[PDB]
């Protein structure tokens, strides 16, 4: 707006947001052409710092190694824009039983190490209490890479900073994730809600009451007292409103709080 390049890098899991996000911005400053790259978050902040990205799509903040890169070239640092929320779902095949989960079960299923507590070496569903045919038939692991933000997140958030199982079966994105455990009656994976299909069941979680919600943000270079260029300034104003709200809503995800939405607008000054 009013004409240029936009170009977007980085998370998987806000790729149908920002593509549908773009479309609705295509259609309303039609000589702007929009390139969306979503192979993980972590490829957003070298593509920000480098400059061949304007907005970096990412489901977790900047690591501090990250945030250095892009300030000693800038001498600021980026901005966090929240754009949505994820309550980050754990998936399982639909005819599996299984109830629910407690976090500690959770970080037993897919962890080393049980940094959360669990004194449970968990190999079966039997070990989380299934029945009958259920008892000893192998938990088969699905996960995102580690270029995954939701990778980082839930290493750090739901397996309290430990380290993955090695069995791990690592899916390139989040709709491989949910499509690999619905083709696996044993099979549980991660990602977030917005993937949920009818073929996969997301489980009950247990410890505003969800363990693991999270924000969803698009970093953008913005200068102290400087306004964003009207490209990335005119496609957050698109995000951030209702109508980008409720985009939120129809991919699955949750809409931000009215207010963040708002503040988000104020302190980018939209």
């Known amino acids: 707006g009013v004409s240029g390049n936009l170009s977007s890098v980085g998370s998987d899991t806000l790729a149908n947001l920002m593509t549908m996000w773009a479309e609705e911005y295509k259609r309303l400053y039609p000589n702007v052409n929009i390139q969306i790259q979503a192979?993980?978050?972590?490829?957003?902040?070298?593509?920000?710092?480098?400059?061949?990205?304007?907005?970096?799509?990412?489901?977790?903040?900047?690591?501090?190694?990250?945030?250095?890169?892009?300030?000693?070239?800038?001498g600021y640092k980026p901005t966090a824009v929240p754009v949505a929320v994820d309550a980050l779902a754990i998936f399982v095949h639909k005819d599996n039983p299984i109830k629910g989960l407690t976090m500690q079960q959770v970080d037993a299923i897919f962890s080393a190490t049980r940094l959360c507590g669990s004194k449970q070496d968990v190999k079966t569903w039997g070990d989380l209490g299934l029945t009958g045919d259920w008892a000893k038939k192998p938990v088969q692991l699905f996960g995102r890479n580690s270029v995954s933000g939701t990778y980082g997140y839930f290493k750090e958030e739901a397996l309290c900073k430990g380290d993955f199982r090695p069995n791990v079966n690592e899916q390139p994105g989040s709709a491989?994730?949910?499509?690999?455990?619905?083709?696996?009656?044993?099979?549980?994976?991660?990602?977030?809600?917005?993937?949920?299909?009818?073929?996969?069941?997301?489980?009950?979680?247990?410890?505003?009451?969800?363990?693991?919600?999270?924000?969803?943000?698009?970093?953008?270079?913005?200068?102290?007292?400087?306004?964003?260029?009207?490209?990335?300034?005119?496609?957050?104003?698109?995000?951030?409103?209702?109508?980008?709200?409720?985009?939120?809503?129809?991919?699955?995800?949750?809409?931000?709080?009215?207010?963040?939405?708002?503040?988000?607008?104020?302190?980018?000054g939209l």
């Open 176 to 268: 491989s994730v949910v499509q690999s455990v619905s083709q696996s009656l044993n099979g549980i994976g991660y990602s977030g809600i917005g993937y949920k299909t009818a073929s996969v069941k997301t489980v009950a979680l247990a410890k505003g009451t969800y363990p693991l919600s999270r924000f969803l943000y698009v970093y953008v270079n913005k200068a102290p007292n400087k306004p964003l260029d009207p490209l990335e300034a005119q496609f957050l104003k698109l995000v951030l409103s209702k109508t980008g709200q409720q985009v939120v809503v129809k991919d699955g995800y949750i809409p931000l709080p009215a207010k963040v939405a708002e503040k988000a607008i104020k302190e980018l």
């Open 39 to 74: 192979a993980g978050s972590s490829t957003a902040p070298p593509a920000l710092t480098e400059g061949t990205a304007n907005l970096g799509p990412m489901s977790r903040k900047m690591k501090d190694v990250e945030l250095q890169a892009f300030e000693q070239k800038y």
